């Protein structure tokens, strides 16, 4: 037992405040509704990272660009990567016009309510699990800079 | 305001009680630590489904046996399947002696506490998301029959 | 039996002549020793095709550019493609600096000697098997133009 | 000048005689049309090897059983393996009831005629190229033992 709490169903404004509470800086696309997190670019391989809220689910995602020569090998390793974390998911986003991306993300289901403490844990856990995947891909020479 | 609720770091006993409170039936392996969920076998392609507790993370997972002729095509589809759900993950488990398995799972991180209502929602959202993915693979002719 | 013949071990000059014999036009890179075959660009998907001679093996290869979005699906289909022809081979050539290529090729072992008629058959058979693979990839929307 | 030689469109009898002339032993399936080559089992990973004649093309092929845990990694290596030889091809044969197989093969197009000497060279070059590929996969731990 940790006691009684009262749960909140957050909107994006609650999330801005809860991020401000933790001293986590966020920035905000002209082109999207995600809260972008500049500190995540400190991890080798990370080009962008953000918090989205959609259909009752908070998502924390990082994006890295993949070298063309590593794309087939990385696609073959996706099972092992997803199996390697209890909480983080990984997949490729491939377009004809861009460099292929590796998306690495964790969700927190919010529609039933959350405490602030649960959000904080999620931010900490996600950052740690995400950066592990992405740094290991970088160190294996799979990513551009 | 709204009401107050208990925040609990659960052990496997907390979860069995919580499943009981939802009238969800669970069975046990003498060979594993998970709580098996017989009702998930009503979706085609599901050979087993279970709740595990691992380092403070609850995992609800479904397992389906994959057709060897569909193993490579499924492996090539994992990005798109993982991209199809906000919450569920999918991956392959391949051994040298068993048929390959598709694991389809959702997690709920319990180390900072959880409430009963969050678990309930987890059980519902996971059953829905997991069953969609498995039913879809089964309809794509990728799975063997239980 | 088709009678007695006398075999020739060709060099690149024999091959130019044998191509001239069949009225097949060839062109010649500043950057390679292959004999390039412009008529093969008449097949949808083909960016270049050539005859190489190396270490006693004549190779007839065509190259097509693959869309990034089709690269993973095509890599998964390489077994089926190679299984589909008795004589043609297919594989990807992927570089970080370029568009991925699909290489589709047939060899003729020449170190033991050949007749002209065997060369002609090879040119005909290769062109037919190669263009089948490449046109089927094009029609399945796997290639750029 | 150099000498003259017979140009022959072969049938399977022409090939058996030609293998005999090279003292290469061949056996037969009551279940297939190929001439099996017992000496190819001396290379590790080779479960079978054979000469087929199909639409006027001679195929020399070797078969190795693939470890299910290496199936996906091998599939991802096929480009590089096919690019490693000027003449040999490699691909997978996956069924729902057998272990997956790696086929490694070379062809010789016979419809415009072949001479005995071209066949001999074919037999030597194929054995060399095919065995290199198979021995290499076996050393990469991809294959099961015959």
Length of chain B: 146
Sort strands A89-93 and A57-65 into parallel, antiparallel or unpaired.
Answer: unpaired
**DSSP string spanning C18-68?**
HHHHTT---B--SS-S-EE-GGGGGSTT-SEEEEEEETTEEEEEEEEEBPH
Give yes or no for A76 touching D (CB within 8 A).
yes
Alpha-carbon distances, residue D16 vs A37, D21, D123 (angstroms): 72, 9, 13
CB contact under 8 A, B72 and C72: no
Residues of D in contact with B75 (CB under 8 A): 72
Burial class (CB in 10 A: 0-12, 13-18, 19+), A70: buried
**Contacts for B138 with CB less than 8 Å, ≥ 6 apart:** B43, B44, B45, B64
Give yes or no for A23 touching C (CB within 8 A).
no
Give yes or no for C68 touching B (CB within 8 A).
no
The angle that helices C68-83 and A68-83 make with each other, rounded to 10 degrees, is 90
CA distance A7 to B82: 29
**Residue with token string 């060279």:** D121
Residues 26-65 of B with CB under 8 A from A: 54-55, 57, 59
CA distance C58 to D87: 9
Determine the 3-state secondary structure of C111 from DSSP: coil
User: Residue A11 belongs to what domain range?
Assistant: 1-145
CA distance B63 to D48: 36
CB contact under 8 A, A91 and B75: no
Determine the 3-state secondary structure of B105 from DSSP: strand
Alpha helices, H only, chain A = 12-21, 68-83, 116-139
**Contacts for C119 with CB less than 8 Å, ≥ 6 apart:** C10, C15, C18, C58, C108
Q: Chain centroid to CA C140: how far?
A: 20
The b-or-e profile of D111-133 (16+ CB within 10 A means b, else e) is: ebbbbbebbbbbbebbbebbbeb
Cβ-defined contacts of C37-44 (< 8 Å, 24+): C40/C127, C40/C130, C40/C131, C43/C131, C43/C134, C43/C135, C44/C134, C44/C135, C44/C138, C44/C139, C44/C143, C44/C145
Cβ contact C3:D9 at 8 Å: no
CB-closest option in B5, B9, B117 to A4: B5
CB contact under 8 A, A67 and C95: no
**E strand or H helix that includes residue B17:** helix B12-21
Residues of D in contact with A79 (CB under 8 A): 72
The alpha-carbon gap from B134 to the nearest alpha carbon of chain D, in Å, equals 20
Give yes or no for A122 touching B (CB within 8 A).
yes
CA distance D35 to B74: 36
Q: Which of B124, D44, C54 is nearest to B132 (CA)?
A: B124
Alpha-carbon distances, residue A78 vs A45, A141, B20, B106, C32 (angstroms): 17, 16, 36, 17, 39
Q: In the numeric block, which tokens belong to residue D17?
A: 């005689």
Q: In the numeric block, which tokens belong to residue A100?
A: 């292929």
Q: Which of B133, B140, B135, B136 is nearest to B69 (CA)?
A: B140
Q: What is the DSSP letter of A48?
A: E
B contact chains, 3+ CB pairs < 8 A: A, C, D
Give yes or no for A68 touching D (CB within 8 A).
no
Q: Which of A14, C38, C58 is nearest to D109 (CA)?
A: C58
Declared resolution, Å:
2.0
Give yes or no for A73 touching B (CB within 8 A).
no
Question: Mapped to the 3 state alphabet, what secondary structure does chain D carry?
Answer: CCCCEECECCCHHHHHHHHHHCCCCCEECCCCCCEECHHHHHCCCCCEEEEEEECCEEEEEEEEEECHHHHHHHHHHHHHHHHCCCCCEEEEECCCCCCCEEEEEEEEECCCCECHHHHHHHHHHHHHHHHHHHHHHHHCCCECCC
Give yes or no for B145 touching D (CB within 8 A).
no
For C12, phi and psi rounded to 5 degrees? -60, -30
Q: What is the experimental method?
A: X-ray
Cβ contact C28:C37 at 8 Å: no
Number of structural domains in chain D: 1
CA distance C36 to C54: 15
Residues of A in contact with C72 (CB under 8 A): 71-72, 75, 92, 94
């Amino acid at each position: 037992a940790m006691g009684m709490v009262s749960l909140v169903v957050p909107d994006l404004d609650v999330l801005r405040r809860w991020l401000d509470q933790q001293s986590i800086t966020w920035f905000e696309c002209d082109s999207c509704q995600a809260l972008h997190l500049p500190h995540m670019q400190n991890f080798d391989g990370v080009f962008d990272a953000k918090i989205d809220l959609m259909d009752g689910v908070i998502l924390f995602s990082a994006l890295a660009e993949v070298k063309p020569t590593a794309l087939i090998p990385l696609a073959g390793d996706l099972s092992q990567i997803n199996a390697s974390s209890l909480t983080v998911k990984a997949f490729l986003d491939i377009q004809d016009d861009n460099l292929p991306k590796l998306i690495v993300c964790q969700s927190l289901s919010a529609a039933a309510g959350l405490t602030y403490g649960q959000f904080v844990h999620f931010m900490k856990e996600s950052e740690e699990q995400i950066s592990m995947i992405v740094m290991e891909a970088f160190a294996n020479h799979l990513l551009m800079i």
